[PDB]
């Protein structure tokens, strides 16, 4: 991640803003560029672009603006104290108190990042924009999904690259990030998948636009210059001369996973899927006979499986991802 953050981001941001958004950032990066990863994520998909737009327009039709959506459904901005308090309550509820170091960061291009610093798990939380009703969801995403799946994975024969090849695993993504995104919005009253949708949309446009064009295009959905800056940089991570079209397509994984998981939710065993580790929903049957399940942990929010399934239905309705639409999307 650190590798894809431009090392001159601040200087370029000031140039952009002081130009009244007409300048195209010329980003630079810590040598060497991770070629393989850039290449892997150099193309945008349009497969779910209509679902993304559907999500965004559903928010805007109910709330008028992102700004109002955020305040009305997000609640108040939290102090550091309030963050630490909510996090501590979460770790206890999740039976993982004392396992993860928690750090508060200003450098983050997202709300949160789970890492391995000093060979040890670390949750970095962005202090800017952490919100009362939303923070719990970030914890369900980062700790209840990424962290638990990671620990469960470490117990499996596919715990490393060779194990994945030997047992014939499909990639973890987009199942990983799909599951995490659903989990973020799981117990919200208005579980719109705004971030997943806008990420997907931004990348799709970035593939054909300059930074300047993209920043302007987003005005239609979000006014705040600072927010738009963040979405633009994310969609163009790795791009040096942003006057040209190009994207880093990774963040399309969120909506991609959401749609596939919701589409197939009736045949997916969610506790097993989490227990098997970093695995695709498609490999569950394949891997079930070989999984080591004795000491695997399932998130607290999956104990009541009927309620969990009801929440998935609520998420579907809220986001206009109805059964018949999913079925036409993926005739699987």
Curated annotation (Swiss-Prot):
Any one of the GO BP annotations: proteolysis
Major location (coarse): cytoplasm
Location of this chain's protein in the cell: Cytoplasm, Cytoskeleton
Keywords: Carboxypeptidase, Cytoplasm, Cytoskeleton, Hydrolase, Metalloprotease, Protease
Domain notes: Metalloprotease with an atypical HExxxH zinc-binding motif instead of HExxH, which interrupts the active site-containing helix without affecting the integrity of the catalytic site arrangement.
Task performed by this protein: Tyrosine carboxypeptidase that removes the C-terminal tyrosine residue of alpha-tubulin, thereby regulating microtubule dynamics and function. Also able to remove the C-terminal phenylalanine residue of alpha-tubulin TUBA8. Recognizes adjacent tubulin dimers along the same protofilament.
Protein known as: Microtubule-associated tyrosine carboxypeptidase 1
Residues represented out of the complete protein: 140 to 471 of 471
